[PDB]
């Protein structure tokens, strides 16, 4: 019975400052990147991801909120069974630890008009063995809305934060996968009808022989996890040839710089 005798006072410990201190060190994880590389589909397309944009993508992310990029690329001359990823497009987005939220409008830009879309890459906190039902649903909805996404040519690369490192795996949807994903409204983790036959691993390699580039939004940045209000599923955006700013950049959270200053 210490009410009055023993009295302590609570001191705020706002959540994102720890995550920011943590994200400042992500660059260490980019020296130990591993691809799952299981002997799956030796005859499907192969996907080469340039290391430069992957390191950048890891470095601009958060350790709990997922970020996503769109993949654009091309097949190397007289070798059509290879898809070299040439570009990663960052669009206005927000995320939770299980899913990412993007505008329904796909990227459009002259620089992109020569390339084909190859699906998307996203980060996730842990190394699940199967492809997420949220991922299968997201990919299928996207496909249903955009005929330029061949279910046989577009893939989903998950970048999972294994301790001290970064493990990459690449999947694609199966026909039954597409058909189930497009009709799924259960945002939960065990929705009705989900099946492991809905996806299959595709081979993926990390290269150094060439370099990717980034396109970013023209009038803003890509991160809206501090402005999720201002994010809209129907928002339109232009792009520009520039490199994305890291997750906790000042322009991503202008509230933190204006509120506590003016008040």
């Amino acid at each position: 019975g210490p009410l009055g005798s023993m009295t302590q006072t609570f001191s705020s410990k706002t959540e994102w400052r720890v995550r920011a201190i943590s994200a400042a060190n992500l660059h260490l994880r980019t020296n130990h990147i591993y691809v799952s590389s299981d002997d799956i589909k030796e005859t499907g397309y192969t996907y080469i991801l340039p290391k430069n944009v992957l390191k950048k993508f890891i470095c601009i992310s958060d350790l709990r909120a997922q970020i996503a990029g769109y993949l654009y690329g091309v097949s190397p001359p007289d070798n059509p069974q290879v898809k070299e990823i040439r570009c990663i497009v960052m669009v206005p987005q927000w995320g939770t630890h299980q899913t990412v939220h993007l505008p329904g409008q796909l990227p459009q830009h002259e620089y992109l008009k020569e390339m084909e879309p190859l699906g998307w890459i996203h980060t996730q906190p842990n190394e699940s063995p199967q492809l997420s039902p949220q991922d299968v649903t997201t990919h299928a909805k996207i496909m249903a809305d955009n005929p330029s996404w061949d279910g046989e040519k577009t893939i989903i690369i998950t970048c999972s934060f294994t301790p001290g490192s970064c493990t990459l795996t690449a999947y694609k949807l199966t026909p039954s996968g597409y058909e189930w994903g497009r009709q799924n409204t259960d945002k939960g983790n065990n929705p009705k009808g989900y099946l492991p036959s809905h996806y299959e691993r595709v081979q993926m390699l990390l290269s150094d022989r060439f370099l990717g580039f980034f396109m970013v939004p023209a009038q803003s940045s890509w991160n809206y996890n501090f402005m999720g209000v201002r994010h809209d599923p129907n928002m339109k955006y232009e792009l520009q040839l520039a490199n994305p700013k890291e997750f906790y950049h000042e322009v991503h959270r202008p509230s933190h710089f204006l509120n506590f200053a003016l008040l």
Binding site: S11, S12, K13, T14, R17, V18, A20, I21, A24, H27, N52, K56, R86, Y111, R209, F210, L211, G212, F213, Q219, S220, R230, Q240, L241, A242, N243, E246, Y248, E250, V251, R253, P254, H256, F257, L258, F260, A261
Partner: protein, 1724 residues
């Protein structure tokens, strides 16, 4: 001295700062006494009696001063007593002075006298002062004092035209400030940092006088920087032998003799000690020492003492209480008011007379401040820094007007306001210092100043100073205010830092120099005088009487500290001090060395704002900052409020510093007192701390961190985060508006696309729209465009166009606006290139052009980026992505020509005894390159390309072609073009000796005069020429048969087509190929060249068979070259050169310790400096390598013939130097000494790398940039100069190899490795240089339409290279339609420009024809811009002055070199120069030309390099004058036409028009002129008319001098003409007037024009000019050359039947006086 010791400098530091009390006993004046009181002791010291005046003490009246000095004492009748005792020493000598006097006794008027003597040193006869010929530095310890000093000295010296000013924090505006500021007033620290930087074209050279005010600051913690300054000043006086006068002003305190020693003050001649009886008002002192040690009791005890002492003056004396915070002023004044209220006391200050009380009530109702609202009505007032300027001025006025009776203030009022009170009270002597993180005592200067403010000077008969302190400090303050606290040195507490600054400056290069340096510090004299204080035993000192070992140990200790912190490389054996970039940044940004070690340890490229703020917070400046318990609450609520997370706990002071910085940016006003003091200190430091970080991470090329640190700099400086509206940076905007705008959260960038209406509507505040719009377009904004020009498949040239896109407004942007250009790789992780950019207000509206190189690779990266960011404006940046998707790289270059292993070809091969005589007694065989080409050159007529490294002997290949020519045509004509004039001269010597002396042909060297040059071309079998001399000749090839008759055309160093003067070369070669294609006989072409990657293009252009194109790549040099490239990662030029000094010496001893070496350096100064430096390093060397390889006895004959003391000093030790300033014989004899083997090293200026007649075993290229002084920036050596320099390391007949070491900024290393180890790609730049060629081709009817211009261009190297590297020439394809379109555009643009300039006419769009101006430009070979500007500058009223100006602005003069200073001096004669322009300009080539022209016309004949510049002026003055007369003749005007016809002969004979003709004769003087005007009239013919003996009696002249006079008199024009008109009367109006004038010359032409004041040999030219004088209407003109008898016809069209006469003129271009003026009538 090897046995040494490492010291603990901490145990040597007087820890208590200026509170150290060296003395142990204190003696008070008679009459002092103590009272005891409960809790506190009082000591009273009575006011002092003035000393009786004494022997010869009379106050000097201002009239008895030197009269130039009396204006400075205007408004004063007699000087002070101290000013009188010092008038002679201050004004009549230049002695260094030290004046010790009590505070307020008038030292600064003594400083005025010193400044006045310096001012008098610079007064002319016109009365003006040479305000640009000196600088005076007044060092004042306190910023407030500095501002009041600028005001006071400015007012007292304005009557002199003298500018007094202080120095702001910014450095770019500071140079403009210093340029025209005569008296700079600053603190010790600002002067220290300025002279730390040093640099190029500094103003510290003009400084004649330094004043150190309050020099007893020496005893403060700041003292060491006064030592730094004085040591630097005196040592620099020794290394320039130019004296600087030092004046110290000091309070009276022990050790003034030591200070005088330290200032090099002669005690006998310039030391003045005035004891405290000289205080202007006597001072009765009360010291109160409180004994109570419980704080709560002490606070009330002190307020009790304050009250009681105030009552002793209430209503009798206004009392000024000093307190040591901004809050304590009010807290204390209110405490005193409340104690007055509790008693009846309040009525004692405010009188019963209500005047003062009502003034106070009014001003407190006018609401000057809330605390003022409280205090002003009662008679109390406060005065401190936080208040407003109006409130502070009102407080000062109300106190001076005696309305306030109790003023409570801070030290700021004692320093920067003259405001004495009768009674001064110092309420406590305890102050919070954040640097020491604790409470501490007041500095001695503050105490002295405050108690100096006691006693109104004329109002009071005595003043009363009360000082309240703790009891323990009594004997201290007693000492300080009674002449007994000695002045000690605090040097060791700062020794490493200070030492590093003299290492970074070059002034200290080893421990020996360091010891020498430390002998100048005040620390040294104090250690000598009283060693026990500084830790030296009395047996120590007798063991070491000069303290050499002790100084060695201190320098050793500081050196090791600096070495551990990575500021310096300290080699303990040698004792040597190698500078580092870390060291330099710590010097230049004033950072302590511990900090920069911390930065170097923690800075990583993957750093974020979080770690950045932590790294900042870990700085050693913040070392003593602590987190006090009472702070932790207020800190806590802020830690979780700032936007940058802080990793570590608030228990740690690093976190507190971080949080304070973030709070200062966010503008959170704190509550705690410790917090506010610690924040002001932290953020004071943050500016240059962060700027030092930014320089570090920028110069390592860390793109992300560079961005973050420049942003943080800017945020710290603007006190806002970038998240805030950029408009907030306009202070004139009201924060209500920017709050409205920030609320809307919308992007600022979208404001640019809206009119003012939609602006006002979007912000929901329409009445502001317009205004917002204005500021939106005032915000700095730049547009960038890019021209990608590939050099190879791995190096890319970029031209970046910066077009400004914002309105300029001086009240916003000032004189300039600075940006960084950062070229960043694809990932934005590395800065591939970067540079500073200055947008000047001059050019706010102009596009700027930047060019640089960047590496590339294959496969091409997706893109690079170019960012331009404001250096000071927040949120102000433009990024342009440079995509490479459409970049067309040139194809990788072909393999070289295989060097075949042929057997060495004997001289026998020549098969000709006469020919073999040229080479027999030189060598037996030819080198492999000549051996391989010999058959093709000698046994063929093929056109040939030899490409090979310099020193491969490519010149003998041209000689092969010539010998073959000589075997074919007994009268064959060969023309040899070489691009450099000095090469032409050397080749002229060699080929004159070979082909004329031996083979008996005519070798000639074109001179530029087309008369002599045409006769040479007709006469010579070998004609040597530079490109433009050949261009002017061969333009008229259709009317010049000799130019077609050429059998052989050799062009040497063809690769210089790529360089700046390439277009003329390309054009003359293209012309020779066109001519040959027209003639029946093809002209053989042989081209010699440096190794070229794209040789095949050159050959195809010049028509060389594949099999006769010899392109050898640099690894086939006959003498093998070993090439080392040393990178130096020091981005500051002077420090980089310093850091390469010892490398130069080590390179000599490693690669050529016994064979001759040449060192190239960037400038003239550097030659002398580096010769001396090599010599010093050689002396200090134990295994020393001497470069004197002859006997000193053999050297005196050669030595004493020189005029340069240092040059012969260095030549004695075997090291010479060459620069553009030596006499031609000095250079020749130093060269021969080098040739002799006598001397082993020569240091040559980069500018002489084309005309050097020596070669060497080892070439060292010291730097690779030089400072261009008209763009005020450094410039990279052309690659051609580097290849030329490397060519000097070549001695076939003497060395098995050559060795070259090229030292360069690291950022250039790779480029050299790419362009020296492989052959060179060269391009054409004729597209930027076509107007003058096109114009000449239109005059010669070669180009008559636009199709003709296209076909012309196809003959060029440009057109060949456009299909091989299109993006370089800005084409995007190599199709025939691409080509023809691009060419049509080029043609169209050039013809349009010519047509606008009224040079050509374009009829029907297709056809072109030449006009008057185009013809004049083509004839006299003059830039078409020059003559267009001439056209729009000449009126009939322009005179000789306007002519000299107009021709001074010619384009032909823009490239004249720049050095300045002596031009600022030569301007002085502009009052006595018969030339009026009324324009002040400097650092401009056209103005240098104008000055040097007047200098020539008045035979100033003073400077040396400026003389060569004058000769370059004169090499074009005559052509420009003739073009002027042709223009003015087209205008028909008479006055300016004949004015310029006279100015021709003026510039030839070096005379004005007032100077009479006699000055033309040799050995003549002005006295001779007065004589020849006395005894008769003044003509050259009149000299001839004199009786020979009368001539001699009037001459007083030698026999050979009279022989020279007669030589001139025989070559002087002696000619009469005959005016004659055929059909004298039978002419009709509008009809033919044919005037034939014949000229009889009395003797045949003896030779060229006698004119020794003119560089080129001329030949007499004449004009016949019929023009009516009254009408200013020229009728007829003709230009003519005469031998003895010449008939010249002129034709004219009559004006009317009115029978009239015309005045005739016959005027020379050369000889003054020979002009005649007849008249003749004509009847219709």
């Amino acid at each position: 001295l090897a046995p040494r010791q490492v010291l603990d400098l901490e145990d040597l530091v007087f820890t208590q700062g200026s509170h150290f009390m060296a003395n142990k006993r204190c003696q008070l004046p008679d009459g002092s006494f103590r009272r005891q009181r409960k809790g506190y002791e009082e000591v009273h010291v009575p006011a002092l009696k003035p000393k009786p005046f004494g022997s010869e003490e009379q106050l000097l009246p201002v009239e008895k001063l030197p009269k130039y000095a009396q204006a400075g004492f205007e408004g004063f009748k007699t000087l002070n007593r101290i000013q009188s005792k010092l008038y002679r020493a201050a004004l009549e000598t230049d002695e260094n002075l030290l004046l010790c006097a009590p505070t307020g006794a008038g030292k600064t008027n003594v400083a005025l006298m010193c400044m006045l003597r310096e001012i008098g040193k610079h007064i002319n006869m016109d009365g003006t002062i040479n305000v640009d010929d000196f600088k005076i530095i007044y060092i004042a310890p306190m910023r407030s004092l500095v501002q009041e000093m600028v005001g006071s000295f400015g007012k007292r010296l304005a009557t002199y035209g003298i500018t007094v000013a202080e120095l702001t924090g910014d450095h770019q505006l500071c140079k403009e400030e210093i340029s025209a500021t005569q008296i700079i007033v600053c603190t010790p620290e600002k002067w220290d940092i300025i002279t730390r930087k040093g640099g190029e074209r500094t103003y510290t050279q003009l400084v004649r006088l330094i004043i150190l005010d309050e020099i007893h600051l020496l005893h403060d913690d700041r003292g060491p920087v006064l030592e730094a300054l004085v040591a630097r000043a005196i040592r620099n006086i020794e290394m320039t032998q130019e004296d600087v006068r030092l004046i110290g002003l000091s309070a009276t305190l022990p050790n003034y003799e030591d200070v005088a020693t330290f200032l090099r003050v002669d005690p006998a001649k310039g030391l003045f000690y005035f004891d405290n009886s000289f205080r202007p008002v006597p001072l009765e002192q009360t010291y109160v020492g409180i004994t109570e040690k419980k704080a709560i009791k002490r606070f009330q005890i002190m307020n009790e003492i304050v009250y009681e002492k105030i009552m002793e003056h209430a209503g009798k004396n206004q009392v000024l209480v000093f307190v040591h915070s901004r809050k304590e002023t009010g807290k204390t004044a209110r405490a005193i008011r409340d104690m007055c209220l509790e008693k009846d006391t309040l009525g004692l200050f405010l009188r019963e007379g209500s005047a003062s009380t009502e003034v106070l009530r009014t001003e407190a109702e006018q609401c000057k401040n809330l605390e003022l609202k409280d205090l002003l009505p009662y008679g109390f007032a406060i005065h401190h820094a936080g208040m407003t300027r109006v409130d502070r001025t009102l407080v000062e006025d109300l106190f001076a007007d005696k309305h306030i009776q109790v003023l409570v203030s801070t030290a700021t009022l004692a320093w920067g306001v003259n405001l004495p009170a009768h009674t001064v009270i110092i309420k406590g002597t305890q102050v919070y210092s954040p640097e020491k993180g604790r409470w501490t005592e007041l500095g001695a200067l503050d105490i002295l100043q405050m108690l100096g403010r006691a006693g109104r000077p004329q109002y009071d008969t005595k003043g009363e100073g009360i000082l309240i302190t703790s009891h323990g400090e009594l004997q201290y303050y007693l000492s300080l205010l009674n002449q007994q606290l000695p002045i000690e040195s605090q040097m060791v507490s700062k020794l490493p830092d200070m030492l590093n600054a003299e290492i970074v400056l070059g002034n200290v290069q080893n421990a020996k120099d360091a010891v020498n340096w430390l002998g100048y510090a005040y620390l040294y004299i104090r250690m000598l005088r009283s060693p026990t204080l500084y830790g030296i035993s009395h047996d120590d000192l007798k063991g070491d009487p000069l303290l050499d070992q002790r100084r060695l140990d201190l320098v050793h200790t500081a050196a090791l500290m600096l070495d551990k912190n990575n500021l310096v490389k300290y080699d303990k054996k040698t004792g040597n001090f190698q500078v580092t970039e870390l060291g330099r940044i710590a010097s230049h940004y004033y950072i302590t060395n511990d900090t920069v070690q911390t930065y170097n340890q923690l800075l990583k490229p993957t750093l974020s704002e979080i770690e950045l703020f932590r790294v900042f917070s870990l700085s050693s400046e913040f070392k003593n900052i602590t987190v006090r318990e009472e702070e932790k609450l207020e800190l806590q609520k802020l830690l979780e409020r700032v936007p940058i997370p802080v990793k570590e706990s608030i228990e740690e002071p690093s976190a507190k510093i971080n949080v304070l910085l973030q709070a200062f940016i966010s503008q959170l006003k704190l509550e705690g007192f410790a917090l506010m003091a610690d924040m002001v200190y932290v953020t004071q430091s943050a500016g240059r701390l962060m700027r030092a970080i930014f320089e570090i991470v920028l110069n390592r090329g860390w793109a992300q961190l560079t961005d973050k640190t420049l942003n943080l700099c800017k945020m710290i400086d603007k006190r806002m985060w970038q998240s805030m509206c950029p408009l907030r940076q306009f202070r004139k905007l009201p924060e209500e508006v920017v709050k409205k705008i920030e609320k809307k959260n919308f992007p600022f960038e979208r404001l640019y696309d809206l009119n003012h209406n939609e602006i006002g509507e979007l912000i929901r505040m329409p009445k502001m729209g317009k205004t917002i719009h204005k500021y939106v377009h005032l915000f700095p904004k730049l547009e960038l465009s890019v021209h990608l020009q590939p050099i190879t498949r791995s190096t890319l040239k970029v031209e970046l166009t910066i077009t400004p896109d914002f309105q300029w407004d001086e009240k916003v942007h000032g004189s300039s606006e600075a940006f960084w250009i950062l070229v960043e790789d694809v990932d934005s992780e590395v800065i591939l290139h970067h540079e500073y950019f200055l947008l000047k207000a001059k050019y706010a509206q102009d596009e700027h052009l930047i060019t640089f190189f960047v590496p590339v690779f294959e496969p091409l990266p997706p893109q690079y980026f170019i960012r331009v960011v404001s250096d000071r404006w927040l949120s102000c940046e433009t990024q342009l992505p440079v995509s490479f998707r459409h970049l067309i790289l040139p194809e990788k270059y072909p393999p070289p020509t295989e060097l075949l292993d042929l057997q060495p070809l004997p001289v026998s091969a020549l098969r000709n005894s006469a020919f073999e005589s040229l080479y027999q007694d030189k060598f037996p065989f030819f080198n492999p390159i000549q051996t391989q080409v010999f058959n093709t050159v000698y046994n063929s007529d093929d056109n040939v390309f030899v490409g090979a490294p310099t020193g491969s002997g490519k010149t003998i290949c041209a000689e092969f072609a010539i010998l073959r020519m000589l075997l074919q045509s007994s009268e064959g004509r060969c023309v040899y073009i070489t691009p450099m004039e000095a090469l032409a001269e050397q080749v002229y010597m060699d080929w004159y000796e070979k082909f004329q002396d031996r083979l008996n042909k005519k070798v000639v060297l074109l001179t530029g005069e087309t008369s002599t040059d045409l006769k040479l071309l007709g006469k010579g079998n070998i004609i040597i020429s530079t490109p433009e001399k050949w261009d002017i000749l061969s333009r008229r090839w259709k009317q010049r048969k000799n130019v077609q008759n050429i059998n052989l055309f050799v062009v040497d160093e063809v690769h210089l087509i790529g360089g700046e003067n390439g277009p003329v070369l390309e054009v003359i070669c293209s012309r020779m190929r066109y001519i040959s294609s027209q003639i029946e006989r093809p002209i053989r072409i042989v081209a010699l060249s440096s190794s070229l990657s794209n040789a095949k293009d050159v050959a195809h252009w010049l028509g060389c068979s594949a099999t006769s194109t010899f392109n050898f790549h640099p690894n086939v040099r006959p003498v093998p070259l070993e090439l080392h490239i040393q990178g130096f990662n020091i981005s500051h030029t002077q420090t980089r050169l310093l850091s390469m000094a010892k490398p130069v010496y080590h390179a000599i001893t490693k690669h050529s310790p016994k064979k001759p070496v040449i060192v190239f350096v960037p400038s003239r100064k550097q030659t002398r400096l580096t010769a001396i430096d090599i010599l010093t390093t050689c002396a200090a060397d134990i295994q020393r390598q001497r470069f004197l390889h002859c006997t000193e006895k053999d050297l005196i004959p050669y030595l004493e013939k020189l005029s340069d003391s240092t040059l012969k000093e260095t030549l004695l030790n075997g090291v010479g130097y060459l620069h553009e300033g030596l006499s031609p014989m000095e250079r020749r004899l130093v060269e021969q000494l080098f040739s002799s083997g006598a001397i082993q090293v020569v240091v040559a200026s980069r500018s002489l790398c084309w005309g050097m007649n020596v070669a060497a075993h080892l070439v060292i290229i010291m730097d690779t940039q030089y400072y261009n002084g008209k763009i005020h920036a450094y410039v990279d050596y052309p690659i051609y100069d580097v290849l030329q320099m490397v060519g000097h390391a070549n001695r076939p007949l003497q060395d098995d190899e050559g060795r070259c070491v090229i030292m360069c900024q690291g950022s250039k290393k790779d480029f050299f490795k790419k362009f020296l180890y492989e052959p060179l790609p060269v391009e054409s730049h004729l597209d930027h240089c076509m107007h003058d060629h096109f114009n000449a081709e239109i005059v010669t009817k070669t180009i008559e339409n636009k199709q003709d211009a296209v076909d012309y261009l196809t003959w060029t190297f440009l057109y060949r290279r456009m299909t091989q590297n299109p993006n370089y020439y800005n084409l995007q394809g190599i199709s025939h339609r691409h080509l023809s379109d691009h060419l049509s555009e080029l043609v169209e643009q050039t013809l349009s420009d010519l047509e606008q300039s009224k040079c050509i006419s374009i009829e029907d769009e297709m056809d072109v024809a030449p006009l008057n101006l185009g013809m004049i430009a083509a004839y006299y070979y003059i830039n078409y811009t020059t003559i267009e500007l001439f056209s729009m500058s000449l009126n009939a009223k322009t005179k000789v002055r306007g002519l000299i100006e107009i021709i001074s602005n010619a384009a032909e003069y823009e490239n004249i070199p720049i050095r300045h200073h002596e031009d600022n001096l030569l301007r002085q004669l502009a009052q006595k120069v018969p030339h009026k322009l009324n324009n002040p300009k400097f650092n401009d080539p056209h103005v240098k030309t104008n000055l040097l022209l007047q200098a020539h016309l008045s035979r100033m004949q003073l400077s040396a390099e400026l003389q060569s510049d004058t000769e370059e002026i004169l090499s074009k003055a005559i052509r420009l004058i003739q073009a002027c007369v042709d223009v003015l003749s087209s205008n028909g005007w008479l006055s300016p036409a004949l004015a310029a016809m006279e100015l021709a002969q003026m510039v030839t004979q070096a005379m004005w028009s007032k100077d009479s003709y006699l000055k033309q004769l040799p050995h003549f003087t002005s006295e001779h002129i007065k004589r020849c005007t006395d005894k008769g009239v003044e003509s050259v013919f009149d000299i001839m008319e004199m009786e020979d003996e009368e001539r001699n009696a009037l001459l007083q002249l030698t026999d050979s001098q009279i022989a020279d006079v007669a030589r001139f008199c025989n070559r002087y024009p002696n000619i009469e003409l005959s005016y004659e008109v055929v059909d004298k009367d039978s002419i009709r109006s509008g009809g033919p007037v044919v005037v034939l004038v014949q000229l009889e010359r009395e003797e045949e032409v003896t030779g060229p024009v006698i004119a020794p004041l003119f560089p080129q040999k001329r030949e007499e030219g004449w004009w016949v000019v019929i023009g009516d004088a009254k009408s200013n209407s020229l009728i007829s003109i003709k230009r003519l050359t005469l031998q003895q008898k010449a008939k010249v016809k002129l034709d004219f069209v009559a004006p009317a039947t009115g029978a009239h006469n015309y005045t005739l003129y016959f005027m020379s271009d050369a000889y003054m006086g020979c002009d005649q003026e007849y008249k003749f009538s004509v009847d219709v």
